[PDB]
C-alpha cells in the first residue's frame, strides 16, 4: 500500500567536496582548489546530466563523487535516519520513488541524493 516515512530508506549519494572541509584532499584532486560555490556548479552539472537521461547517477557517482562510496557505485542500501546526517535524512525521507533532492549541503560538501527505492 501507500507507506511513506519509514525507518529504512534507500537512496544513492554523490558527493563533491570543497576546500573548506574535513580534508581538502579528494581522490580526484590532491588539493581541492574548488570552494562550495565552485563545487555547486559541478553538482548542477551532474544533476542536469542525470535527469536529462544523458548520464546515470551510479555512473557519475562512481567517477565524479569525492566519497569512498564512489567505487561502490555510490548507491546505498536501506538505512535508518539515525545512521546518516540530518540534512541527508531530511532529503532522503522527503523524496518520493525515483525522486532527486538535488544539492544537499553538508559538512563534507554537497551531496546529491537520488531515491533508488
Swiss-Prot record:
* EC number(s) from the headed UniProt entry: 5.2.1.8
Q: Report where it is expressed, by tissue.
A: Expressed in immune cells in the lung (at protein level). The phosphorylated form at Ser-25 is expressed in normal breast tissue cells but not in breast cancer cells.
Q: Which residues form the PpiC domain?
A: 6-117
Top-level EC class as recorded in UniProt: isomerase
Please give the residue positions where the record annotates the modification Phosphoserine.
25, 62
User: Which reaction is catalysed here?
Assistant: [protein]-peptidylproline (omega=180) = [protein]-peptidylproline (omega=0)
Record PTM text: Phosphorylation at Ser-25 by DAPK1 results in inhibition of its catalytic activity, nuclear localization, and its ability to induce centrosome amplification, chromosome instability and cell transformation. Ser-25 is dephosphorylated upon IL33-stimulation of dendritic cells.
Biological processes annotated in GO: cellular response to hypoxia; negative regulation of amyloid-beta formation; negative regulation of cell motility; negative regulation of ERK1 and ERK2 cascade; negative regulation of protein binding; negative regulation of protein catabolic process; negative regulation of SMAD protein signal transduction; negative regulation of transforming growth factor beta receptor signaling pathway
Compartment(s) where it occurs, according to its Swiss-Prot or TrEMBL record: Nucleus; Nucleus speckle; Cytoplasm
> At the top level of its lineage, which domain of life is listed?
Eukaryota
Query: Where would you say this protein principally sits, based on its record?
Result: nucleus
| One term of GO molecular function | tau protein binding
Keywords from UniProt, A to Z, are: Acetylation, Cell cycle, Cytoplasm, Isomerase, Nucleus, Phosphoprotein, Rotamase
A Gene Ontology cellular-component term: cytosol
The entry's function note states: Peptidyl-prolyl cis/trans isomerase (PPIase) that binds to and isomerizes specific phosphorylated Ser/Thr-Pro (pSer/Thr-Pro) motifs. By inducing conformational changes in a subset of phosphorylated proteins, acts as a molecular switch in multiple cellular processes. Displays a preference for acidic residues located N-terminally to the proline bond to be isomerized. Regulates mitosis presumably by interacting with NIMA and attenuating its mitosis-promoting activity. Down-regulates kinase activity of BTK.
Instruction: Relay the domain remarks.
Output: The WW domain is required for the interaction with STIL and KIF20B.
Q: How does it assemble?
A: Interacts with STIL. Interacts with KIF20B. Interacts with NEK6. Interacts (via WW domain) with PRKX. Interacts with BTK. Interacts (via PpiC domain) with DAPK1. Interacts with the phosphorylated form of RAF1. Interacts (via WW domain) with ATCAY; upon NGF stimulation. Interacts with PML (isoform PML-4). Interacts with BCL6. Interacts with FBXW7, disrupting FBXW7 dimerization and promoting FBXW7 autoubiquitination and degradation. Directly interacts with RBBP8/CtIP; this interaction depends upon RBBP8 phosphorylation.
**Name recorded for this polypeptide:** Peptidyl-prolyl cis-trans isomerase NIMA-interacting 1
Which residues of the complete protein appear here? 51 to 163 of 163
Amino acid at each position: 500500500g501507500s507507506h511513506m516515512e519509514p525507518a529504512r530508506v534507500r537512496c544513492s549519494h554523490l558527493l563533491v567536496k570543497h576546500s573548506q572541509s574535513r580534508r581538502p584532499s579528494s581522490w580526484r584532486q590532491e588539493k581541492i582548489t574548488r570552494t562550495k560555490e565552485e563545487a555547486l556548479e559541478l553538482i548542477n552539472g551532474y544533476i542536469q546530466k542525470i535527469k536529462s537521461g544523458e548520464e546515470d547517477f551510479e555512473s557519475l557517482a562512481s567517477q565524479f563523487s569525492d566519497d569512498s562510496s564512489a567505487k561502490a557505485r555510490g548507491d546505498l542500501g536501506a538505512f535508518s535516519r539515525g545512521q546518516m546526517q540530518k540534512p541527508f535524512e531530511d532529503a532522503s525521507f522527503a523524496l518520493r520513488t525515483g525522486e532527486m533532492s538535488g544539492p544537499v549541503f553538508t559538512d563534507s560538501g554537497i551531496h546529491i541524493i537520488l531515491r533508488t527505492e
